[PDB]
Design a protein around this nucleic acid. Sequence first.
RNA 1: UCCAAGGAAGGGCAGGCGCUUACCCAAUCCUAAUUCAGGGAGGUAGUGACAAUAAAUAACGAUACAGGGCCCAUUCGGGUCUUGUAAUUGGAAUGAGUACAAUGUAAAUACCUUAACGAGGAACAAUUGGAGUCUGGUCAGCAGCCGCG
Lengths: 534, 30, 355, 103
Amino acid sequence: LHVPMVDRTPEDDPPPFIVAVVGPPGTGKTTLIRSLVRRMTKSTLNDIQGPITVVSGKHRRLTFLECPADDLNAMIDIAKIADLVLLLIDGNFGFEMETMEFLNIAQHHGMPRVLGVATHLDLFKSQSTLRASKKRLKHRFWTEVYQGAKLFYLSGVINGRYPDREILNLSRFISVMKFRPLKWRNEHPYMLADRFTDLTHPELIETQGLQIDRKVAIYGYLHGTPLPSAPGTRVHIAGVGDFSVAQIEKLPWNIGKLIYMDNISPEECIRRWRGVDLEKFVPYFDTFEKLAKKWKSVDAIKERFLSYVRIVFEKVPMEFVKNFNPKFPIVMGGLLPTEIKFGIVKARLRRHRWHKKILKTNDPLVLSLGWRRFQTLPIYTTTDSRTRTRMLKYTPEHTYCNAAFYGPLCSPNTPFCGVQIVANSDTGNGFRIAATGIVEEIDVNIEIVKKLKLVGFPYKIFKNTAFIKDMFSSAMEVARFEGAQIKTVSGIRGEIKRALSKPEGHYRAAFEDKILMSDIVILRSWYPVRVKKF
Amino acid sequence: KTEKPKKPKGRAYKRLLYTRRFVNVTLVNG
Amino acid sequence: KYTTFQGSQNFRLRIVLATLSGKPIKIEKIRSGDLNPGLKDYEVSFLRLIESVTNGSVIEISYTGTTVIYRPGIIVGGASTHICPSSKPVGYFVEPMLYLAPFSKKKFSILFKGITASHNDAGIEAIKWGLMPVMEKFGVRECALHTLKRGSPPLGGGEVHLVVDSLIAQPITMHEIDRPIISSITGVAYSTRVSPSLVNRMIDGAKKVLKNLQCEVNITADVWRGENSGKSPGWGITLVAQSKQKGWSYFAEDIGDAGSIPEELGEKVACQLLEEISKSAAVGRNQLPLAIVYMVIGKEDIGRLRINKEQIDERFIILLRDIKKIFNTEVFLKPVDEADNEDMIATIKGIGFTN
Amino acid sequence: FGGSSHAKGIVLEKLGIESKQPNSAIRKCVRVQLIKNGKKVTAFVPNDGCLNFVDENDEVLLAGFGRKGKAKGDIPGVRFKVVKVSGVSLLALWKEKKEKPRS
RNA sequence: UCCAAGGAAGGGCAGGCGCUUACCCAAUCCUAAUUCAGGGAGGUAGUGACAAUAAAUAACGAUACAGGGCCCAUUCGGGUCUUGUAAUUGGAAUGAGUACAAUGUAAAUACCUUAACGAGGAACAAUUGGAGUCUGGUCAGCAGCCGCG
């Protein structure tokens, strides 16, 4: 309620509005971008320099973003910072099991206002049967995924595309309908980059090499809670790593000054301002003659009763210069205290809809936590009695685990999205969604328990005079556990008496009934194995 | 969602029921 | 490790604010020129207490003791029991742990053994009456100090059970811009191993001074006799001025030693109390770091505390300098529109989750 | 209720209600403050668990039980049941037919 | 409202949300510099569970194995035996939909027709329910012996 309140007030025309065009690579996304900006600037500009600052008057300026459908990272990176989803669809999607999983990412990380745009349904359809298919898509999406969004249908008029009233309906929905607040986004300072300049402190043998990072001046506008408040704060560069900032630039008789002037002694602050340690809690007073004679009369207390940024970096290293490219959009985050730390985190999970596998504990998983993408081994555990007595081997449809792993710690219990990684040529989406959940709590130094099983198969048993035919081969083992308490999966406990110098399985023990002849007589509580760190 | 019902739809369900009813009826009256 | 400090000045405060900040610190050159260099006993033992109430923290101590490295961990705590040494009383240890009290995942239930009185640190009823309703003003619902036994100097023998129940994530923002009207004056006069009359003589020492005012003065006689009175005899007295509309307070305490006079003790605590009334706007100098620290670590908003010109001493200036060194949060004072007093208003941007 | 059929509210905390069948498996209850009235009303969630889905501190839609008051059985005096968190209708999240929003 | 700072100019209007609007004068009539053409006259497409309308998801044959099959009294027990499991297996019959043509003809869109295709269950993918003394899994809490949820 106050997290939406901090966002809207400084936001005005030079802070843009975030709009992404997301869709398949084959369709004319770029054509829709050109005809969309054809309405804004006068009638003829059909050249793409994206991302670029779109000056849409003094009322609302915007900035537009597209990303290719094969990039696994920035498809995630665009999803959490958006304020409008504009999806372009074909006449060939809807049960395509490998091309439309990003819908779940926008479902989980925060859904803004969404849009369906139908364009290739004219070159493919020629008859009255397109009307039932469009309404069929209205049965699927987006009317079922959110009640309160409009599915648009546009003509296929690829390059040569209209300026007329249909993008006045599109710019009607863009121009009028605004954004719903995203909770955990607006508690962080976060900024999209607009311009990007490389300052190298000109040519020297300490300017280029194998290890040289230079002063990058980056340029953009602010979003969320204010980042310029102090120099030398922290930041995250997506895909590259977490860094600090060196120097940030911003382009949109008094005791209160003398206290912060640290070349002045505090007795000179008191001395200039008019006219010893907190290890003594009780404050200073004068002598009893002075306070007594001074406070003989008590009259003196008788009323006392009834925008734009120019950000400087000393980063990043030389190998990212060789990964320079046209600006496939890059976003800056801001890390908080109790999240710069590392720790073991406990998080609730479940299995994901339109996913077709199972998850062992040894296959590492790619996790998106806030602004950070990290590969971590997801060791699962369950309780069965409001206390843990086992772990599991792979998270089923049967039960839904309590997952634990080690990485960056995240106190405010954020929602938690887990992608199984594929290559750039496996499905058609850069990831495929493995599981989703929520950070439940933070807990360092916890220890999982897996109860193994020493095996003894019964054959002929009575209560007091009890042997096991086949359970052991060493006598000194039983000599050590003679002070212990044994079991059976049926639930009538035993207590071993004495090894009796027979290391053949046969030895005398105790049960508080006679264990039955279709039972399994065992022993419990085995070694509490460690956590894989990565 | 369950894959449990396989049972027919519409008219074919009413035919089978009628046959079963007749069989049940033959016993008790006879 | 990199945030560097000097000497034993503000040792507990920099450990506590280092813990809440999550920033590692390094306090060096503690008592390098003194006869017994390095840390004292109570400083080492207090660092053991911080090692107890936390997890993941690492404290490194130099072999000469002059250099201390502090990396904090998460705040856990729980139920335990600490022994206090004879060099400092229990209130020296109850004093910093109130800051970390709501910010744990488990309730602070730690029993304390040690001396229960001194002339420099905090007493029992000072913490119970002067700190705990004031942290209840900042949004703590349930907090309690349970004295099992008292201990007079030099031997002590006191047990106080510290339990904090309510767990918040940040303090609520406070706006105290006006000087309150004090309702009544109460207080506690306790004693161990001695007469039931010298308590009444201390309360005579209060009634000689606080008789001229127009508020009621109602002071409780508290005599402990038996094993509850510890090993050593003694007597102490504590006064609290309370305002029942918003529930504000002020306090002053002192104990009497061997050969001292109970009536002059009562007049001394009374005159220091009225002196603390005159030096104040909203809280006392004894209540000042609690309010300043609680307004710093609140949620991200502007808060205001009316302070007086007498309350700004060197302790307050070094306090805000240490806040700038730890959290880098800055407070700004505006002169009030009144001309009767000379107060000014503290403006605080709360930290929230700012890095 | 105030006479109407439903009331929309906010989770404060998660309690513990257990069972005897099939064995001791936890059936739970949740604590919801009313938005419109401020009275604090408990509720029950009829399913296999589903405490996992909802959260602390989120938006629910309470609903009546249908007996003119009159709690069902050995759950003690609980009169109301939960239908919709975040507008997406728990039963649809129960099968798999929806995925829950961000909050 | 604009300003080159001289001066020049429109009448505060509709429309929409809050409860995406196109084509044509072929007919009727009117006008015509009028047997030419025009008409913000006129005519033709977009919009759909509060409702509601018809009926498709299969029809007919064949054989070898096999019977403690069904009903009434929850009972104690009694009356009536015409039964199903196997692709054993075979030919039929069709339109949901795919598509030229013509009619329609504001130029014209849809509608009335249509050769060409098109099934043995993965089919060409109905459901929301409801019970059920049913089957399974390591849980108060423990002995002199046997268990309970």
